[PDB]
Amino acid sequence: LDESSVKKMILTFEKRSYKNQELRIKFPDNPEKFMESELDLNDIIQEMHVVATMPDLYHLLVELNAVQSLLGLLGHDNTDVSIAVVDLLQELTDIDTLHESEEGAEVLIDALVDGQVVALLVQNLERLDESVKEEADGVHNTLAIVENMAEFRPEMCTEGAQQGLLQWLLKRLKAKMPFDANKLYCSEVLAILLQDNDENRELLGELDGIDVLLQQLSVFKRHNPSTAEEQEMMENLFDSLCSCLMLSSNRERFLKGEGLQLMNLMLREKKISRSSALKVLDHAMIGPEGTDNCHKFVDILGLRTIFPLFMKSPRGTTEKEHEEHVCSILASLLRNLRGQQRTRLLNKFTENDSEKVDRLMELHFKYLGAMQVADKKIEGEKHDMVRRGEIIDNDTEEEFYLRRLDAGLFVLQHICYIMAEICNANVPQIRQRVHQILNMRGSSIKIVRHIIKEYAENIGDGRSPEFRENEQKRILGLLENF
């Protein structure tokens, strides 16, 4: 159809909108008087879905106050109308369609945001009722809208969350309603809001969200969830929780919500979620800000949980990934721990004639070998690239880095840092053991030292500048007393 067909439609809607509003004001409890215009409005709304197909003429909608009318209509006293509008809004903003016309799309988006679209969607949700199939579908379309908007443009997630979305999502997740498709959807949307968005992580924390997250996870601590969809939800929740843990402010909250105990329990009871519960543990401990958590871990016998996992790797989660988190956690513990807990941790490295140390060195040799092979492969790639005429650029460099990471760079680094910290503790047995074994193959003290220097260069991206010198300093301190 043509902009002759379309331009009609909008203004028709406006008339039908305005008229319906007027009539509804005039006869607040005489249904008879507004009803046929109610139907007229509904029909015109349904017919609009058409417009999605023409992505540019979106610019038009804005101009003739269509958008604004729509936004108002999510407040319309009759849920049948608002659901219909929601559906229309979801069709308009279906992401494939948007990537047809970025100009029509862009201005529509701008209009939508400027109107507090998310806030009005949430208001609508607050009065929807899911025991009624069309309403429940309204919720789903609502969520779909925000998923579409996030995909088209990130910056707004911060504003949207504060516009009551995040809080509603939390309420929905804690709601005592059987798991259903909406809940799953909620779980992914929350995760989408939370990646890279610290004000939302913070906001979640303030909203007491950490508790909520832990309780849902609580649910499947001993048993697995009923269906594949519910397990995907769990994974979603886990992701969200890890995101939240990137913010320092949230480590305290985790601690006081007994997050640590829970994850420990999960690790002991060998659920599939355990692969994730290891990740969570890792996140909960990484930086200086994971110091209290590190100590509490030891207090609750985390050591007994973690060391068996260190000694043996059980086989979605691969062997490498499993080792990675464990070693990372150990690294964090060696960094942050102090006093009795630290002493206890070191005792593990002495025990059974430093079997842990023998483990460590075994791991080292495993990952090192891999690393060597990958780096050789990368060398060969370079040479061939030169021969052909292909220029090594940023994309080729990132691809190489990914390949290296796959081979276990981070875990290697972690191992080596453990080795270093261990040796720096005044324990002859340990140093002897390390040096014994290196010289048992010869290969070697400098290698480790090189590896540690590489690690020191890089991390952190990072949080503070002054911090980053000091950390490098302390790492290098470990290299002399080796």
Residue numbers in the entry: 77 to 391, 397 to 563
Can you list sentences taken from the study reporting this PDB entry?
CTNNBL1 is a spliceosome-associated protein that binds nuclear localization signals (NLSs) in splice factors CDC5L and Prp31 as well as the antibody diversifying enzyme AID. CTNNBL1 comprises a HEAT-like domain (including a nuclear export signal), a central armadillo domain, and a coiled-coil C-terminal domain. Our results identify CTNNBL1 as a unique selective NLS-binding protein with striking differences from karyopherin-αs.
We crystallized full-length human 6xHis-CTNNBL1 and N-terminally truncated 6xHis-CTNNBL1Δ76 (to generate a fragment that is necessary and sufficient for NLS-peptide binding). We were unable to solve the structure using molecular replacement and therefore crystallized selenomethionine-substituted protein for experimental phase determination, solving the structures of CTNNBL1Δ76 and that of full-length CTNNBL1 from crystals with the symmetry of different spacegroups. The crystals reveal the same overall structure of CTNNBL1. However, despite excellent continuity within the protein chain, we were unable to resolve any density for the N-terminal (76) amino acids in the structure of full length CTNNBL1. The N-terminus contains a disordered region and a structured HEAT-like region that includes a functional NES.
